[PDB]
Amino acid sequence: ENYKEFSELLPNRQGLKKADCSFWSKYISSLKT
Amino acid sequence: HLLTARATNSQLFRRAVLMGGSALSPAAVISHERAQQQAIALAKEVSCPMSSSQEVVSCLRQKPANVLNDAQTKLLAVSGPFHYWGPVIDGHFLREPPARALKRSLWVEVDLLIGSSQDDGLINRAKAVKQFEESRGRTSSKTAFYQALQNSLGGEDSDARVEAAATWYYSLEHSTDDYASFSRALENATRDYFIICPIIDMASAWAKRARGNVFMYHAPENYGH
Lengths: 33, 225
Ligand SMILES: *[C@@H]1O[C@H](CO)[C@@H](O[C@@H]2O[C@H](CO)[C@@H](O[C@@H]3O[C@H](CO[C@H]4O[C@H](CO)[C@@H](O)[C@H](O)[C@@H]4O)[C@@H](O)[C@H](O[C@H]4O[C@H](CO)[C@@H](O)[C@H](O[C@H]5O[C@H](CO)[C@@H](O)[C@H](O)[C@@H]5O)[C@@H]4O)[C@@H]3O)[C@H](O)[C@H]2NC(C)=O)[C@H](O)[C@H]1NC(C)=O
Prior knowledge:
The structure is cut from a larger assembly and holds two copies of chain A.
Chain A: E1 3-4, E2 12-13, H1 18-32
Antiparallel strand pairs in A: 1-2
The complex binds a molecule of 6 linked components (NAG-NAG-BMA-MAN-MAN-MAN).
């Protein structure tokens, strides 16, 4: 799940908002159903 | 003993050093229905003639202690923390459930030194039960224990939504194909539910009504010994 970061050095990262999107995708969708 | 009100002249102690437990744990006080179910289940395993309460207690009072210990260990091996053997209401020594009883705020200068350890898992509390069960070799019945523990995570009465929230927050997706990470997550959930957080809540509820000093510690996990 690699993504570029538009910083001064332009580095590479792997997780974008993993906790927040795991909340908004796994938990709260099951709670919605 | 901290919860129970007493005449001030006959106060049995002055301070309290509780290392790794609290009255505000959900498994601290057992309701009447669960206790009677435990008694009749132990009656069924010992094969007492279950007719009345006096009859079953009279049958149970004559059995040897080794047989009763073996039967209670066999039943407790596949039972949740809410199905343990604990204190009941009794109406005389205790009056009300512990959270309500803590709000009287009548104690007379009782200090408190309370704390925990990072390796005080509730699964780790049942090592001897596991060793006895593996000594008999009863199919290595640990998935029943883990299922009952996961159901016990859902409050007193097993409710679906608290179970879903608990399985989300800690990473115990029900992947029993690898028991290492799931078992560690189950220890994590039971330790944070039954041990750490009631200790913190009791320390808060004792320090808030300022009539005694409260000190709290926490021991990190010690590898070895
Ligand atoms: C049961 O309970 C146990 C506690 O008794 C848990 O053990 C502990 O779990 C926590 C979970 O958060 C661990 O905390 C992490 O510690 C890392 C320390 O760095 C190094 O150590 C790790 C090994 O212990 C190693 O895997 C790491 O990769 C690292 O080499 C922190 O880095 C880590 O930070 C997280 O949160 C930060 C919040 O801002 C975030 O910045 C971090 O960034 C990383 O990920 C983001 C994406 O989110 C990327 O963009 C970054 O590039 C970077 O890769 C990261 O998200 C976190 O705080 C703790 O180490 C662990 N052990 C101990 C001894 O405390 C168990 O996990 C519990 N569960 C089970 C099943 O047992």
